Amino acid sequence: LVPRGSHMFIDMENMFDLLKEETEVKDLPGAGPLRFQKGRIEFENVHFSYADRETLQDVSFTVMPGQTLALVGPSGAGKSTILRLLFRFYDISSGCIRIDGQDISQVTQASLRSHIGVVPQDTVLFNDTIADNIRYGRVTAGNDEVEAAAQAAGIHDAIMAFPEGYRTQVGERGLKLSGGEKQRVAIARTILKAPGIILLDEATSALDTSNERAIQASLAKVCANRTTIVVAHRLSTVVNADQILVIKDGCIVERGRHEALLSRGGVYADMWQLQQGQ
Numbered sequence: 001l002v003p004r005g006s007h008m009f010i011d012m013e014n015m016f017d018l019l020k021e022e023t024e025v026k027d028l029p030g031a032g033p034l035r036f037q038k039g040r041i042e043f044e045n046v047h048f049s050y051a052d053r054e055t056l057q058d059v060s061f062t063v064m065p066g067q068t069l070a071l072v073g074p075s076g077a078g079k080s081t082i083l084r085l086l087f088r089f090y091d092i093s094s095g096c097i098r099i100d101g102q103d104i105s106q107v108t109q110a111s112l113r114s115h116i117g118v119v120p121q122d123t124v125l126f127n128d129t130i131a132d133n134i135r136y137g138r139v140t141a142g143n144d145e146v147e148a149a150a151q152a153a154g155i156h157d158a159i160m161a162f163p164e165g166y167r168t169q170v171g172e173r174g175l176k177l178s179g180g181e182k183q184r185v186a187i188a189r190t191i192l193k194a195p196g197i198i199l200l201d202e203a204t205s206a207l208d209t210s211n212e213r214a215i216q217a218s219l220a221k222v223c224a225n226r227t228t229i230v231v232a233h234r235l236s237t238v239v240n241a242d243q244i245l246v247i248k249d250g251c252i253v254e255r256g257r258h259e260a261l262l263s264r265g266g267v268y269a270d271m272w273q274l275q276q277g278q
């Protein structure tokens, strides 16, 4: 029977609440919306730890409005973690992440994310119509806007050939989309959302040459005048990026555009030489 000391004052509902696994992020009291101007991103001396070494160590960079930054490096280096931090999926222990001059930890998370389009490695399809799957990107959007995003994503024509056009039930219950179609839906959702910043985590699988090239074209489209951070797997992404950060063990070991990193003859040059295969 009778629980004592502090335990007699414990709220069980609070204990259940604390048992939840993702143990997330809170808006600071009075936080206002992010005053988004053109999407300049800055990490200043960022440190971050999931547990107990540092996952990210003194990470500093800027992405100027509309430029693309590619993160490259071995697995485990901390690339995806960087995208996660910009999304405020976790708080940082030291340093500062700003968008347009503003600490992202001091604005509402909802306003922050309303400005960020996430293109994940693989696309979640909902048991829902192709239209509502796209509208997942901005759930208040008109059918007209959904069409327009799909037109821009290069998926409109394939949708028109589905038996119910934009009404076609997709997902596991519905019509199976091709690999190309699925990725384009993610692109369309992002176009529809029309954010100022894109966090792109490239798939480590690829379709055939023709689809890869088309998909890659469509992606370049969605990013071209948006501030973009891409965890790059494709060589063409890196070649054409405005800046590349080479991450190793949480640290940016070297950085610059492609040609400048080659001419540096360091770690990125070693990678490029290895892929080249003289």
Ligand SMILES: Nc1ncnc2c1ncn2[C@@H]1O[C@H](COP(=O)(O)OP(=O)(O)O)[C@@H](O)[C@H]1O
Binding pocket: 050, 051, 055, 073, 074, 075, 076, 077, 078, 079, 080, 081, 082, 231
């Ligand atoms: N959710 C997590 N909990 C604990 N450690 C993690 C978690 N996610 C990633 N890590 C570790 O953080 C380090 C960086 O991972 P990640 O940022 O995904 O690297 P990358 O994208 O470069 O492969 C890796 O060692 C990974 O094992």
